[PDB]
Design an enzyme around this catalytic site. Structure first.
Site, PDB file in Angstrom:
ATOM      1  N   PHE A   6      31.661  26.572  29.893  1.00 19.26           N
ATOM      2  CA  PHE A   6      30.248  26.204  29.913  1.00 19.26           C
ATOM      3  C   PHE A   6      30.049  24.895  29.151  1.00 19.26           C
ATOM      4  CE2 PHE A   6      25.969  27.759  30.877  1.00 19.26           C
ATOM      5  CZ  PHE A   6      25.202  26.893  30.124  1.00 19.26           C
TER       6      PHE A   6
ATOM      7  N   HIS B 199      29.570  34.087  28.951  1.00 21.71           N
ATOM      8  CA  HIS B 199      28.424  33.386  29.523  1.00 21.71           C
ATOM      9  C   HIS B 199      27.676  34.102  30.657  1.00 21.71           C
ATOM     10  CE1 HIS B 199      29.697  30.021  27.055  1.00 21.71           C
ATOM     11  NE2 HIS B 199      30.893  30.063  27.616  1.00 21.71           N
TER      12      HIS B 199
END
Lengths: 457, 124
Positions: free
Chosen positions: B120, B12
């Site tokens: 996430f 991410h």
């Protein structure tokens, strides 16, 4: 025989100079996504110029630019060059650097496979390309021009090429807005061509239902066609209807049919089911991102259970299928001995739908080898049913449960079953599932107990 | 073996990266970051902010995780992100992605000590 294959590496001047002697001797050189730039293309040119054994050169996904690409093609013009496969995919080739193509293609009479995908050459660049392709000495078997900024004006030049060539096996022009009239010109070129085309891919090319009678004519004219990809085009049910008569011809031996996102609904799926029942040759079918709905799914399942159907892979991700269609897939998973792969991700099946599927899979006589159930709204309450499947099923090798609603508790139930060495599953996929460090510890403990077990996240 | 915090950065974090000029950004990044190995990750988000900025999120508004966990945090400001969505034409090992860019608030799950992103959760 000598081969070098680099994928995804940062080649430093040190690591780079190492390879130069290899590039001058090897038959196969693949340097893909290696951070190469124009600063290195003169080395490549020199190396290649002195390499009479080189047959494959791939430089896909490197920022070579027009200068870099120019230098590389220049080095491929020795009467000694023996190259058969060339990929300059995603190398920053623009129309500005295409002026060299006509000369390169005239001299490279051994070239059979050319990949220029993901270069914004545009129509001006394409025309220069076709000036080379038009050369009598240019005899490609495969041409890939996916995502090259081409439009309808490129179709006539391409069609003119097809009419006079006979060696073409594969053509991909996907992700170029050729438009309805451009696609008609292309089809006409294919019909008039003596080439025994094996693969045709035209995803997202502005094809409409109006083009489908011509595409039907194209299919009919190519008994050698094994793969047809018309995805991401607004074909609709009417388009499919115009297409199917050609697919039903005895001479049609289509192996793979890709119709992802083609505005197809139940009745269009019905037209295709006719093809599934009559064409044992058809092994792979994608109807992903089409609103088939439960009625659509019911039709597929009934066709899949017909003696004439030998479908091996079915792609139906994002097809608006609910739990109501799952009893019909059950009959398939139970009876069909041909279906080995079933992609049903991104359908609102819920625990109900998945529990139903688990009922059929909790028998030891199934044949399904791969099942994708990602983003199907599966929760913890559906994991015990999946756990049972992992215990009782003797065919399933891969199971994808990514992007579901489950958490640690659900996942833990799955790991418990996998503790058994007799379990058939080789790969469990769990992307974007969140579990705490506590579950992870139980997860890594299992992986070390059973190294052959792949758990992907 | 990697920690959850390391996995989060790999999957991410791309502080200096940018996708606005590169439609093939996701194709490169998903492959480079080991998210197309064995199976094509269906969807993924990359954040183009300093690592320290994303980590600071754990000290911001507490919200509920989508799975109902309570250790989730929403960024105070909208961050620069690139979304990667697997295309329906994909068949492993061929993973083709659609690249899209946004500026949106992110929601991450924070765990361990030190208290850093390990998952996430969403963009809002």
């Amino acid at each position: 025989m000598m081969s070098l294959d680099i994928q995804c590496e940062q080649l430093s001047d040190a690591r780079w100079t190492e390879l130069l002697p290899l590039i001058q001797q090897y038959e196969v050189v693949r340097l893909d996504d290696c951070g190469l730039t124009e600063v290195r293309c003169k080395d490549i040119s020199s190396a290649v110029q002195a390499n009479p054994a080189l047959t494959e050169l791939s430089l896909r996904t490197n920022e070579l630019g027009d200068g870099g690409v120019g230098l590389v093609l220049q080095g491929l013009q020795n009467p000694t060059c023996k190259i058969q496969k060339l990929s300059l995919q995603n190398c920053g080739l623009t129309e500005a650097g295409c002026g060299i193509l006509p000369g390169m293609l005239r001299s490279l009479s051994t070239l059979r496979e050319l990949h220029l995908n993901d270069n914004p050459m545009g129509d001006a660049g394409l025309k220069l390309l076709c000036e080379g392709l038009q050369d009598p000495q240019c005899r490609l078997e495969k041409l890939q021009l996916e995502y090259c900024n081409l439009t309808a004006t490129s179709c006539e030049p391409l069609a003119s090429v097809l009419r006079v060539k006979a060696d073409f096996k594969e053509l991909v022009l996907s992700n170029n807005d050729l438009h309805e009239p451009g696609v008609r010109i292309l089809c006409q070129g294919l019909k008039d061509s003596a080439c025994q085309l094996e693969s045709l891919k035209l995803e997202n090319c502005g094809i409409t239902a109006a083009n489908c009678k011509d595409l039907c004519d194209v299919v009919a004219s190519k008994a050698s066609l094994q793969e047809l990809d018309l995805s991401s085009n607004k074909l609709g049910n009417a388009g499919i209807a115009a297409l199917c008569p050609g697919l039903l011809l005895p001479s049609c031996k289509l192996r793979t049919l890709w119709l992802w996102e083609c505005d197809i609904t139940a009745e269009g799926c019905k037209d295709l089911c006719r093809v599934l029942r009559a064409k044992q040759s058809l092994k792979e079918l994608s109807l992903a991102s089409n609103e088939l709905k439960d009625e659509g799914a019911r039709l597929l399942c009934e066709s899949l259970l017909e003696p004439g159907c030998q479908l091996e892979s079915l792609w139906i991700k994002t097809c608006s299928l609910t739990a109501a269609s799952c009893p019909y897939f059950c009959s398939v998973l139970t009876k069909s001995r041909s279906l080995l792969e079933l992609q049903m991700s991104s359908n609102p099946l819920g625990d109900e739908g998945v529990q139903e599927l688990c009922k059929a899979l909790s028998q030891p006589d199934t044949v399904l080898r791969e099942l994708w159930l990602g983003d199907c709204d599966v929760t913890n309450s559906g994991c015990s049913s999946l756990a049972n499947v992992l215990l009782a099923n003797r065919s399933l090798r891969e199971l994808d449960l990514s992007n579901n609603c489950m958490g640690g508790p659900g996942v833990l139930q799955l790991l418990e079953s996998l503790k058994q060495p007799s379990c058939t599953l080789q790969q469990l996929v769990l992307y974007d599932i969140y579990w705490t460090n506590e579950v992870e510890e139980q997860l890594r403990a299992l992986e070390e107990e059973r190294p052959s077990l792949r758990i992907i996240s | 073996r990697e920690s959850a915090a390391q996995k989060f950065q790999r999957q991410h974090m791309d502080p200096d990266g940018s996708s606005i000029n590169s439609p093939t950004y996701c194709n490169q990044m998903m492959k480079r970051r080991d998210m197309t190995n064995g199976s094509c990750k269906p969807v993924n988000t990359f954040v183009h902010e300093p690592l320290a900025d994303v980590q600071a999120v754990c000290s911001q508004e507490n919200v509920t995780c989508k799975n109902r966990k309570s250790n989730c945090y929403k960024s105070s400001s909208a961050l620069h992100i690139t979304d990667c969505h697997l295309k329906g034409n994909s068949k492993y090992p061929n993973c083709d992605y659609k690249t899209t860019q946004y500026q949106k608030h992110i929601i991450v799950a924070c765990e361990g000590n030190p208290y850093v992103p390990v998952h996430f959760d969403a963009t809002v």
